[PDB]
Design a binder for this molecule. Structure first.
Ligand SMILES: CCCCC/C=C/C/C=C/C/C=C\C/C=C\CCCC(=O)O[C@H](COC(=O)CCCCCCCCCCCCCCCCC)COP(=O)(O)O[C@@H]1[C@H](O)[C@H](O)[C@@H](OP(=O)(O)O)[C@H](OP(=O)(O)O)[C@H]1O
Ligand SMILES: CCCCCCCCCCCCCCCCCC(=O)OC[C@H](COP(=O)(O)OCCN)OC(=O)CCCCCCCCCCCCCCCCC
Ligand SMILES: CCCCCCCCCCCCCCCCCC(=O)OC[C@H](COP(=O)(O)OCCN)OC(=O)CCCCCCCCCCCCCCCCC
Ligand SMILES: CC(C)CCC[C@@H](C)[C@H]1CC[C@H]2[C@@H]3CC=C4C[C@@H](OC(=O)CCC(=O)O)CC[C@]4(C)[C@H]3CC[C@]12C
Ligand SMILES: CC(C)CCC[C@@H](C)[C@H]1CC[C@H]2[C@@H]3CC=C4C[C@@H](OC(=O)CCC(=O)O)CC[C@]4(C)[C@H]3CC[C@]12C
Ligand SMILES: CC(C)CCC[C@@H](C)[C@H]1CC[C@H]2[C@@H]3CC=C4C[C@@H](O)CC[C@]4(C)[C@H]3CC[C@]12C
Ligand SMILES: CC(C)CCC[C@@H](C)[C@H]1CC[C@H]2[C@@H]3CC=C4C[C@@H](O)CC[C@]4(C)[C@H]3CC[C@]12C
Ligand SMILES: CC(C)CCC[C@@H](C)[C@H]1CC[C@H]2[C@@H]3CC=C4C[C@@H](O)CC[C@]4(C)[C@H]3CC[C@]12C
Ligand SMILES: CC(C)CCC[C@@H](C)[C@H]1CC[C@H]2[C@@H]3CC=C4C[C@@H](O)CC[C@]4(C)[C@H]3CC[C@]12C
Ligand SMILES: CC(C)CCC[C@@H](C)[C@H]1CC[C@H]2[C@@H]3CC=C4C[C@@H](O)CC[C@]4(C)[C@H]3CC[C@]12C
Ligand SMILES: *[C@@H]1O[C@H](CO)[C@@H](O)[C@H](O)[C@H]1NC(C)=O
Ligand SMILES: [Ca+2]
Lengths: 1326, 25
């Protein structure tokens, strides 16, 4: 009471925030050691706990006598503070042994500072506002995982326990892979045997022993992290014939489809939120201030011109001389000459700083050393001259000159630092290359690029708050991991770099887990630390939450920002055009209004010059939806020989034969042996190539005897040369291989042959052109980071084969290697790491691999251990350098990738219509009207006799208790189906089998009862009942095969067990929100098959190229090209490409085939494998991903109107509900129905559409009367042609209410909008 | 770092070349 008013003065809150920050620092200063060891500093820090606990208790005690209790405790943040202080007090007074779960509450102490800063609370509310629609998606995701886990429980259960054991001596498996006992699986090599029991591949953690292990491994497989290892284990345990059919869908449905759904839902939420009043009002302010500044610039230009004229006329006839000099200076820095000179100087500086490589000549080093001073002086003089000319305030007015000033002062600091201490370089003089961005000014894309930065800078508070909130949650999870696994990772040879001992190590581990790389390995290691696969699995829950709520939180931080700022920029740019042209025309109206004494020709000038700028009305679907949302929100606020060849080419039945020839040639390419070059099959393919190219040249001469043609010429002539050199010895085998590889352009000929495929290709090209500018900016930024990394790390990635030698002159001779418990002599050789930063190209490649996230911890370790220019690594020498990588990850993979996605989303052009002129009044109105236009009044087909028997069955089956019982049977069946496990007791298995028997019998009972309840053909009319029949017959077949004698050794018949697992889809009906979302996205996917064909063609072309080039690499194991992942066959090449597309070790596969590979024994060559892989793998990761990103958006936009519902006038989805309700009354079509039913029908349906409460029913009472009604015909007439029409016509775009007399005009407009429907609606319109 | 074919731990990142697959560099 009295204490409240006199203590809530701000310094009290600031003192509490200081205490919280100090407590966070103390929690960060902790150190953990294994086996009970303790640092003295930890003992010193432990004494500070009572002070913090007392201060928190006092701060929470003063609030209780100022807000009461169960209102002080009304706030959730106060509840969290209270539980924190209560657990602290209990821990202080708790001497008992049970405090581990009580000491873990301290990790929530940082969150207290969220409650102390209300801005952080607002930002947290904003970020969590977008995770509510995603929850349903998560449910769907769960439905997927379970649905696959059950399948994984029926095929892979107890398969990873056999292993190659020597001869039963002490149970030491020679290898870490599952084997098979004399089967198409992996046979044991040597004299070992496939014995029973071996923990498993990953300490026995990734398996399908029961439903929990299956769920965990499926979830670990849908994050595209280590799924190929499980695929390979299943391959070598059961044969690789059918395993892909389980894992490719799991990746496709569980990863690509889920990500597409999440992406679409988030984009729809952002679009809906962007048009709220509180955000639109801020955007209008941001636009208004920019517009004011744009005018003020020109007005100061006016003022300065006038001032210099005044000064010139005054002087023409001390202060005057310097003022004239200042004006001349202020005019020599605003000319195009100065712009181009400074840009050329910047470009030369970039070129000279970009030539720095390792082992450069000394002369180049000295030249660059002097050029650095020369360029710094030139830039210093230019900055001083510009500042003197424009003036200090005017110079700092521009946001770009502030960056230049900061870069200049940082460069001076770096120069003096390096002069007083020769050594490392900060890397700030390279940042001057960002000034090269001023090349965009002379282009027509300056406004767009500049408005994005104006939008960004306008939101420094929100982005900082969001970036500090992401760090706050990364610090809370690091502390939790420190409490859980702190000092417990020494259960093996050495502690890993990914540990939780110190705070820097823990936070770096949490960051690495958030990036998703090797998180499953850390999960396995932590589980083993907590102890075995038996009693340590609960700790896995730490890594799931960190993976889930870290995977979509980042996507919620970085996408939203982009989806905001870019969108804002777009609007601003568009506005800056319309606010100009609409003014310019006005000028032409005044230029003619001012002159009446002479016939003005300027009136026609605007008329002929007004339509030149109205042709670029792109208006992507995002902009149209934004406009419609603005309209809805404002409305809601208001309411409150030549001839012969020509004939041959023009023949209608001629493109088809060319197409089939191309397809046959492509298949001939697919079926080839890269390694067994001396094969009869290869000779047959050579013959087919002869005939195939012969027909291609035959269709070329005649096509040219009367861009894409060049392509055809090169693919025809290329094969020609190969034939010319084929009829001789092995002349220029390099050219032979090149011309054979050039043959892969055969499918591309179809691009222009199929109009739809050409259209989708043009859509891809337009999407790339819409983002080329951001692509250029991204490349410039990545080049800057590459130069910085070259300065930081060049020359420091060398090592000696034994770690004792740190110099090259010492790395000579032999050394003792202690491996496999046998010391052996090994050569002592000085080598270099695979990925380094020796020059700018190597740095760019390394940073690209880091951006993909593959193997970036390895390069982080190599960068930390780097010591000097010619020294070997020293562990943990420079930990602070990891900042670099962290910053990199915050920029390119987090920010730039998300702005790429947002830019493609917000600029996606409509392709279905390609025009804005259909009716100009309907976007979803026509979609909702067509739903009632197409579907007839479907009925349930009630019995027409109802005598004694058929009626009884019909009533029983349609009884709601019956469907309740059947859903209960579904639930119990799916509980029993996941209840099996490994090495279960025999009676347990028998009980499970009997439960399956009785459940299948019950389902067959329902299936045969529905037949007599409805009828034979009436039952199979629905597409779902036939599915139930098929699955129940499959279950019957499987149970008969299991019970009665089974197929001894003939074709396998184990797939029938899938049938009983197909009943889960039977319970997917109850997800009314889930079902419609799934159906909508699937239907959108089935509407775009040609983009899928383009993706498949990309995969086909790359697979063929890889087969030809890398096909004959030796299959030696211990490398990335081995018995599991190779280019040997077309299917293997496709699997390798899919593995790279998801991204597992694509850089490792790239390294595994480069120009110096031991080559295959059966191969005819001695040197196989080229440096083409550098291009081959880098382009693919660019292309595939891009196409995928083009596919996802192409689906999302197709459902954008659904993803931006804001359901208050929902019409497309309520028609199905109305049909469901109406089907209860109408027995059949019957032509017309009676009068009394509709009065109750208006209430049977959902009240939201027609009458919300009793009062809106009056409006309904107005709809049935007061206007012309079909009552003119027979009294018993349908009104479904007049009720739902009326509701969907009056709910939005209502104009016949104010007048009520001009009905014929509206009817004519409606009819002419539906002119061709075969005149079926005429009866409905009445 | 560990040479080709040597026994390794995935979470050590101490293979000279390649990754630590199936417990071997
Ligand atoms: C989530 C975290 C990750 C974020 C990382 C990405 C952050 C941003 C990443 C991408 C955003 C960039 C998008 C495109 C960038 C440049 C394209 C064109 C944009 C652009 O140039 O507009 C600048 C950009 O300012 C910078 O900061 C120059 C560039 C520096 C931006 C990077 C700075 C480093 C990061 C910030 C560090 C903190 C400092 C700001 O615009 P402005 O306010 O200067 O606009 C004036 C105005 O138009 C003047 O009329 C014009 O003069 P006149 O021609 O006489 O009219 C001025 O030009 P000059 O005086 O030079 O002739 C313009 O510069
Ligand atoms: C929504 C987003 C979508 C994004 C992606 C869209 C594009 C996807 C493009 C394709 C994806 C990759 C397909 C991977 C298929 C790999 C199949 C495979 O590995 O099969 C292995 C097995 C044996 O293969 P092989 O090495 O030839 O056997 C030697 C002994 N006969 O093979 C067999 O036994 C073959 C069995 C029949 C295969 C028919 C096909
Ligand atoms: C969210 C929706 C999720 C559902 C949709 C997606 C599901 C797709 C995946 C379904 C499962 C496919 C098969 C997975 C296991 C692959 C087979 C395998 O690894 O085992 C080989 C099996 C027998 O192996 P083994 O034990 O060695 O044989 C006895 C030893 N002497 O050898 C066999 O005989 C196995 C035969 C495998 C099946 C043959 C082809 C089936 C075609 C499937 C079409 C699509 C599936 C439709 C139904 C979906 C699930 C209900
Ligand atoms: C910003 C714009 C101007 C890009 C300009 C390209 C150069 C900055 C790049 C591309 C070609 C690169 C050069 C081409 C390849 C190499 C590797 C290397 O050349 C060698 O032959 C020495 C290597 C050795 O013998 O060990 C030295 C760097 C150099 C020439 C590169 C230095 C950086 C260069 C000059
Ligand atoms: C979304 C963004 C804002 C969150 C990014 C998290 C960073 C703030 C964290 C994760 C990685 C952390 C870095 C991980 C490791 C280190 C080295 C470490 O420096 C040391 O003191 C180690 C020296 C030693 O003890 O031997 C602390 C800084 C730095 C780069 C950390 C600073 C804080 C970083 C950059
Ligand atoms: C979907 C279509 C267009 C892709 C091309 C079809 C692929 C899958 C087909 C076309 C011809 C097929 C080849 C035909 C003949 C053989 C020889 C046999 O001893 C091994 C399999 C192998 C090598 C086949 C593998 C699959 C194959 C390459
Ligand atoms: C026009 C395109 C699709 C032709 C592709 C047809 C494939 C399936 C045909 C064409 C030539 C055929 C090969 C011709 C010769 C031999 C050698 C023989 O000892 C084994 C079969 C084998 C290896 C055949 C396998 C099937 C084969 C590869
Ligand atoms: C924002 C982007 C585009 C420009 C700024 C990024 C560059 C210039 C900055 C970001 C973080 C910086 C790093 C921060 C900390 C260190 C540790 C120090 O001991 C060596 C330099 C080094 C490694 C810095 C190098 C320069 C660096 C990488
Ligand atoms: C949804 C829930 C309530 C019912 C479905 C879950 C059932 C099928 C799950 C939940 C817990 C699971 C059990 C958890 C632990 C063990 C011990 C192990 O040594 C054998 C498997 C066994 C016995 C599991 C069998 C499957 C099981 C019983
Ligand atoms: C479209 C363009 C960019 C394709 C990329 C072309 C360059 C990067 C590729 C094309 C063919 C490649 C060459 C193919 C074969 C060999 C033989 C090998 O023993 C050394 C590398 C070397 C000499 C390759 C170097 C890289 C190379 C020249
Ligand atoms: C060694 O292996 C062979 C076959 O693998 C087996 O017959 C023999 O019994 C084994 N040795 C012993 C001592 O069991
Ligand atoms: Ca990975």
């Amino acid at each position: 009471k009295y204490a409240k008013r006199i203590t809530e003065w701000p310094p009290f809150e600031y003192m509490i925030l200081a205490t919280i920050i100090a407590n966070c620092i103390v929690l960060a200063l902790e150190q953990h050691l294994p086996d009970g060891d303790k640092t003295p500093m930890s003992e010193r820090l432990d004494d500070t706990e009572p002070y913090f606990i007392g201060i928190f208790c006092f701060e929470a005690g003063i609030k209780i006598i100022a807000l009461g209790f169960v209102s002080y405790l009304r706030n959730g943040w106060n509840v969290m503070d209270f539980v924190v202080v209560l657990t602290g007090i209990l821990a202080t007074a708790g001497t008992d042994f049970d405090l581990r779960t009580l000491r873990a509450v301290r990790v929530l102490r940082p969150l207290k500072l969220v409650s102390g800063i209300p801005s952080l609370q607002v930002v947290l509310k904003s970020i969590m506002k977008a995770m509510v629609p995603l929850l349903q998606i998560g449910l769907l995701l769960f439905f997927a995982i379970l649905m696959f886990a059950i399948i994984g429980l029926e095929f892979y259960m107890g398969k990873f326990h056999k292993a190659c054991f020597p001869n039963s001596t002490d149970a030491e498996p020679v290898g870490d892979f599952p084997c098979g006992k004399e089967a198409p699986a992996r046979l044991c090599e040597g004299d070992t045997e496939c014995r029973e029991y071996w923990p498993g591949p990953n300490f026995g953690i990734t398996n399908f022993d029961n439903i929990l292990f299956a769920i965990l491994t499926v979830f670990q497989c849908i994050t595209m992290e280590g799924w190929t290892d499980i695929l390979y284990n299943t391959n070598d345990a059961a044969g690789n014939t059918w395993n892909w059919l389980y894992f490719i869908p799991l990746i496709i449905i569980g990863s690509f489809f889920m990500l597409n759904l999440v992406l679409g839902v988030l984009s729809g939420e952002f679009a809906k939120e962007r048009e709220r009043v509180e955000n639109r009002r801020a955007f209008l302010k941001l636009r208004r201030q920019q517009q004011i500044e744009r005018e003020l610039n020109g007005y100061l230009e006016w003022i300065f011109k006038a001032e210099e004229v005044m000064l010139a006329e005054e002087d023409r006839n001390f202060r005057r001389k310097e003022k004239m000099f200042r004006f001349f200076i202020r005019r020599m820095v605003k000319a195009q000459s100065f712009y181009w000179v400074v840009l050329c100087v910047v470009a030369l500086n970039t070129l000279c700083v970009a030539m720095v490589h390792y082992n450069q000549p000394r002369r180049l080093t000295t030249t660059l050393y002097f050029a650095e001073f020369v360029f710094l002086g030139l830039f210093l003089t230019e900055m001083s001259l510009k500042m003197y000319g424009l003036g200090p305030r005017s110079y700092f007015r521009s946001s770009f000159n502030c960056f230049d000033f900061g870069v200049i002062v940082g460069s001076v600091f770096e120069v003096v630092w390096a002069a007083i201490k020769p050594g490392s370089s900060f890397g700030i003089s390279v940042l001057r290359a960002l000034r090269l961005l001023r090349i965009f000014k002379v282009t027509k894309y300056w406004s767009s690029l500049r408005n994005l930065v104006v939008s960004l800078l306008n939101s420094m508070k929100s982005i900082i708050s969001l970036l500090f909130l992401l760090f706050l949650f990364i610090v809370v999870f690091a502390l939790l991991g420190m409490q859980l696994f702190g000092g417990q990772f020494n259960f093996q040879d050495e502690t890993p770099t990914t540990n939780f001992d110190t705070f820097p190590a823990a936070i770096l581990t949490v960051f690495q887990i958030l990036t998703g790389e090797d998180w499953n390995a850390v999960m396995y290691h932590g589980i083993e630390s907590q102890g075995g696969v038996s009693k340590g699995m609960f700790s896995s829950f730490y890594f799931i939450v960190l993976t889930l709520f870290g995977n979509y939180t980042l996507l919620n931080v970085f996408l939203a920002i982009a989806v905001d700022n870019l969108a804002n920029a777009q609007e601003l740019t568009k506005d800056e055009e319309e606010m100009e042209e609409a003014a310019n025309q006005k000028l032409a109206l005044q230029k003619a209004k001012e002159v009446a004494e002479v016939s003005p020709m300027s009136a026609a000038n605007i008329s002929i010059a007004a339509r030149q700028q109205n042709s670029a009305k792109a208006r992507s679907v995002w902009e149209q939806r934004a406009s419609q949302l603005r309209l809805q929100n404002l409305r809601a606020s208001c309411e409150a020989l030549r001839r012969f060849c020509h004939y041959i080419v023009t023949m209608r039945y001629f493109e088809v034969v060319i197409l089939v020839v191309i397809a046959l040639s492509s298949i001939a390419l697919a079926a080839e042996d890269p390694v067994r070059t001396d094969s009869p099959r290869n000779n047959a393919l050579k013959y087919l190539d002869y005939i195939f190219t012969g027909v291609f040249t035959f269709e070329m001469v005649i096509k040219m005897i009367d861009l894409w043609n060049i392509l055809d010429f090169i693919v025809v002539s290329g094969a020609l040369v190969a034939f010319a050199f084929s009829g001789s010895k092995g002349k220029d085998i390099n050219t032979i291989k090149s011309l054979r590889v050039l043959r892969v352009l055969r499918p591309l000929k179809t691009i222009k042959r199929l109009p739809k495929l050409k259209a989708v290709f043009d859509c891809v090209v337009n999407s790339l052109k819409n983002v080329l500018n951001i692509l250029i900016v991204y490349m410039l930024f990545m080049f800057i980071f590459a130069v910085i990394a070259v300065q930081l790390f060049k020359g420091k990635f060398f090592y000696c084969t034994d770690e004792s030698k740190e110099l090259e002159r010492d790395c000579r001779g032999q050394y003792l290697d202690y491996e496999k418990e046998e010391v052996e002599a090994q050569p002592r050789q000085w080598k270099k790491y695979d990925f380094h930063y020796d020059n700018v190209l190597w740095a760019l490649l390394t940073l690209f691999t880091v951006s993909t996230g593959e193997g970036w911890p390895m390069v982080l370790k190599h960068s930390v251990d780097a010591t000097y220019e010619e020294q070997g690594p020293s562990p943990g020498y420079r930990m602070e350098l990891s900042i670099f990588y962290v910053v990199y990850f915050v920029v390119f993979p987090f920010f730039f990738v998300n702005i790429f996605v947002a830019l493609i989303i917000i600029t996606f052009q409509e392709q279905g219509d390609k025009v804005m002129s259909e009716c100009s009044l309907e976007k979803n109105e026509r979609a909702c009207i067509d739903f009632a236009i197409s579907a007839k009044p479907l009925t349930r087909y009630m019995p027409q006799n109802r005598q004694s028997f058929q009626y009884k069955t019909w009533t029983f089956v349609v009884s709601p208790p019956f469907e309740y019982f059947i859903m209960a049977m579904i639930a119990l069946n799916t509980v029993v189906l996941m209840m099996k496990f490994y090495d279960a007791p025999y009676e347990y298995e028998l009980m499970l089998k009997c439960l399956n028997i009785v459940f299948t019998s019950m389902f067959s009972m329902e299936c045969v009862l529905k037949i007599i309840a409805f009828g034979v053909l009436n039952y199979f009319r629905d597409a779902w009942n036939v599915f139930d029949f098929v699955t129940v017959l499959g279950s019957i077949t499987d149970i008969l095969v299991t019970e009665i004698a089974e197929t001894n050794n003939f074709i396998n018949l184990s797939f029938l067990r899938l049938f009983r697992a197909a009943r889960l889809i039977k319970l997917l009906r109850q997800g009314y929100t889930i079902r419609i979302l799934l159906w909508t996205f699937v239907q959108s996917f089935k509407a775009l098959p040609y983009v899928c064909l383009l993706i498949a063609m990309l995969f086909f072309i790359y697979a063929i190229i890889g087969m030809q080039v890398f096909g004959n690499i030796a299959l030696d194991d211990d490398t990335s090209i081995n018995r599991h992942n190779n280019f040997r066959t077309f299917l293997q090449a496709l699997m390798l490409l899919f593995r790279s597309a998801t991204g597992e070790a694509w850089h490792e596969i790239m390294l595994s085939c480069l120009s110096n590979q031991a080559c295959d024994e059966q191969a005819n060559a001695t040197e196989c494998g080229s440096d083409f892989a550098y291009f081959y793998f880098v382009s693919f990761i660019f292309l595939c991903s891009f196409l995928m990103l083009n596919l996802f958006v192409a689906v999302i936009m197709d459902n954008f109107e659904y993803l931006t519902r804001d359901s208050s006038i929902l019409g497309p989805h309520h028609l199905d509900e109305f049909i469901r309700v109406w089907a209860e009354y109408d027995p059949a079509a019957c032509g017309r129905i009676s009068y009394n039913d509709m009065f109750e029908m208006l209430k049977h349906m959902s009240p939201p559409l027609g009458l919300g409460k009793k009062c809106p029913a009056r409006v309904a009472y107005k709809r049935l009367v007061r206007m012309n009604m079909p009552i003119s015909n027979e009294d018993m007439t349908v009104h479904f042609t007049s009720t739902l029409m009326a509701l969907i016509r009056t709910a939005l775009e209502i104009k016949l209410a104010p007048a009520g007399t001009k009905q014929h005009q509206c009817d004519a407009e409606l009819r002419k909008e539906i002119s061709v429907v075969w005149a079926n609606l005429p009866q409905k319109t009445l | 770092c560990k040479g080709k074919g040597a026994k390794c731990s995935r979470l050590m990142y101490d293979c000279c070349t390649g990754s630590c697959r199936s417990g071997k560099c």
